[PDB]
């Protein structure tokens, strides 16, 4: 029994050991209560405004569309405190944890972005934060690890399995199954067992709400399409949600194509995986032929997650949203182009969304189209990655 529907069509659900169901049911009840509580909403709105910096700008990018019939706006989540959209929902989940009387936060992280977001929300709201990170990811994300530690979070390397994100995920769940009476599991994307895909969407939906208001103010009509990268699905569903009922607005999610779909080295389970049951959910995932969970790949660590949120799989199945992929090389070109022609350094995650908008423009330059790209983060963190690749290829 649940208060809300745990499924999006065939996808989603609550596929956790029995011992964790009370924790999920408690969380769903607290969320439903909080969503009805004006004082909770006012507290959340106050943090978003006065601490995180909402509303974020909606920036028209004149130089990169010159000579075409594309009008391109960037929704500037790169300007949010922490430099990525993740801050929105960790503030809401931290307030939920407090509403439940929890004084400890568990979080998983692969690229270290959600780890930093969880750590900053925990520092602000006086929560003891512990972060599980696969030991391979600890090694290659030393800047984000140091940020988490500066913010007082305890970072715990995970050496089991493949020592990366899914293995940190397991360890977070193992911890929570014994500690949920005092700890809240602050899951980092719009995936996992119900109620998380729903909570994370609702705590990210101001991205699309603001975008709709801002584009109506500036253009007097809705976008032709909104475009967002998809690692787990949170920034994309945050942009999409308020447009789902505006059936003329295209919703385009961009998975990482890595070295190319045909190489198998990619992060595009929604279009090129197979439905499985893992991560607490029924969803497309990258897996072996006999059902072992596989390794994904992207130049962008924040997109390097071998499954996807169940609402995205559902919106695809009914045709409401379309999902595409963008390769490392395409994302790198979009990264360089935004820097040089708009003076904005985009996150390599977000560069995947930008690259697909650039393709939409360039393929059909006389097509009238009003596009919004969700610029989910800034790319200061990526400049060494981009430098090293550009140097190895002689640029």
């Amino acid at each position: 029994t649940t208060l809300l529907n745990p499924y999006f069509g065939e996808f989603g659900g609550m596929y956790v050991p029995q011992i964790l169901m009370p924790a999920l049911n408690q969380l769903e009840e607290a969320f439903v209560s909080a969503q009805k509580d004006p004082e909770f909403q006012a507290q959340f709105a106050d943090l978003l405004k006065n601490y995180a910096g909402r509303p974020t700008a909606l920036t028209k990018c004149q130089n990169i569309t010159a000579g075409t019939r594309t009008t391109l706006y960037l929704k500037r989540e790169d300007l949010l405190h922490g430099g990525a959209h993740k801050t929105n929902q960790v503030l809401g989940q931290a307030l939920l944890a407090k509403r439940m009387g929890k004084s400890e936060i568990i979080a998983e992280t692969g690229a270290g972005q959600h780890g930093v977001a969880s750590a900053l929300a925990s520092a602000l709201l006086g929560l003891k934060c512990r972060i599980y990170m696969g030991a391979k990811d600890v090694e290659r994300q030393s800047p984000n690890v140091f940020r988490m530690r500066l913010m007082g979070a305890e970072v715990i390397p995970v050496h089991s399995g493949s020592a990366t994100l899914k293995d940190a995920c397991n360890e977070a769940l193992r911890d929570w199954s014994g500690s949920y009476e005092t700890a809240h599991y602050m899951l980092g994307t719009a995936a996992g067992p119900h109620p998380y895909p729903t909570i994370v969407r609702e705590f990210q939906r101001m991205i699309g709400e603001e975008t709709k208001a801002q584009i109506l103010d500036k253009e007097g009509r809705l976008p032709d399409a909104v475009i967002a990268c998809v690692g787990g699905g949170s920034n994309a569903i945050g942009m999409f949600a308020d447009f789902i009922n505006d059936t003329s607005v295209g919703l385009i999610g961009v998975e990482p194509g890595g070295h190319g779909i045909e190489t198998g080295e990619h992060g595009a389970p929604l279009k090129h995986g197979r439905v499985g049951i893992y991560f607490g959910m029924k969803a497309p995932m990258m897996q072996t032929a006999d059902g072992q969970i596989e390794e994904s790949y992207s130049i962008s660590a924040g997109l390097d997650f071998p499954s996807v949120g169940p609402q995205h799989a559902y919106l695809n199945s009914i045709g409401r949203a379309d999902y595409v992929s963008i390769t490392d090389d395409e994302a790198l070109e979009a990264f360089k182009t935004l820097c040089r022609h708009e003076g904005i350094i985009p996150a390599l995650e977000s560069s995947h969304a930008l690259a697909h908008a650039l393709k939409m423009m360039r393929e059909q330059p006389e097509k009238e189209q009003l596009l919004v790209v969700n610029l989910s983060g800034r790319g200061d963190k990526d400049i060494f990655t981009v430098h090293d690749i550009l140097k190895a290829r002689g640029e």
Partner: protein, 265 residues
């Protein structure tokens, strides 16, 4: 076939509890795992619980996490596990065999096809670790259609609704969980209320598991009214400690199981 029912009737006739070891199929290799299982039976195991190596065993502590990796290091696949299961049943016609599965391995090539394969090799029960009773309908229906008992966890905090669901939906035995957290012999209380209400609701006989590592825990569980006890990590620790000595591994396994099985009389 009704192997749990025959075993429990026979144990009840002898005023005796079941002792049920858990091991990972193919840990540390296929040939040694077959010998391990034959030794556990030869030492007095009443039934078996057998894990199929999975990439992400999120309900398992370090000891069984490591067994999975040892099995993967030997190239063990689910297909090879089912070949092993068929041979085990062929050697041991009456011992109940239960699998401990993660959902994706069951769902992977079709839920119905998985339970059909269990029936064909002679498996008696399946516990899917990450399928709570609330999500269990397609799994328990496929199980029952193929004469497989679906096993459900009854956790410490079970409210009355969960007790009624577990009693109504489970077969073979009820897995009575001794605590929260994950598996491991490093972390160790059968409440008479759950055991009583399970009997009141005509549940399958209760086996206690998680942390069971000493003979007096086996006797404590039977005394509380459970029909027996399951021990996992404690057995797999013996495998881990004696990897370099295959023969000493079998002998220490023989002694521990005999000790635990004696505690249930």
């Amino acid at each position: 076939m009704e192997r749990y029912e025959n075993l429990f009737a026979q144990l009840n006739d002898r005023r005796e509890g079941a002792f049920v070891p858990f091991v990972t199929l193919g840990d540390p290799g296929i040939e040694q795992s077959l010998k391990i299982i034959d030794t556990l039976i030869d030492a007095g195991a009443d039934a078996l619980e057998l894990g199929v190596p999975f990439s992400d065993p999120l309900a398992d502590g370090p000891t069984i996490q490591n067994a999975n990796l040892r099995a993967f290091a030997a190239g063990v696949t689910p297909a090879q596990c089912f070949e092993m299961l068929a041979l085990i049943r062929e050697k041991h016609p009456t011992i109940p065999i239960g699998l401990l599965m993660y959902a994706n391995l069951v769902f992977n090539n079709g839920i119905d096809a998985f339970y059909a394969r269990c029936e064909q090799v002679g498996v008696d029960s399946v516990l899917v670790a990450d399928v709570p009773v609330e999500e269990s309908a397609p799994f328990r229906q496929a199980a029952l259609r193929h004469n497989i008992a679906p096993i459900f966890i009854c956790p410490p905090n079970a409210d009355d609704d969960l007790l009624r669901q577990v009693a109504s939906y489970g077969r073979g035995y009820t897995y009575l969980l001794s605590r929260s957290g994950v598996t491991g012999a490093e972390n160790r209380l059968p409440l008479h209320h759950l055991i009583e209400k399970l009997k009141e609701y005509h549940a399958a006989p209760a086996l206690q598991g998680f942390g069971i590592s000493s003979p007096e825990q086996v006797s404590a569980a039977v005394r509380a009214g459970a029909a027996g006890a399951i021990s996992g990590s404690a057995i797999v620790k013996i495998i881990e400690k004696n990897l370099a000595s295959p023969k000493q591994m079998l002998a220490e396994l023989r002694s521990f199981v005999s000790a635990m099985k004696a505690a249930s009389r």
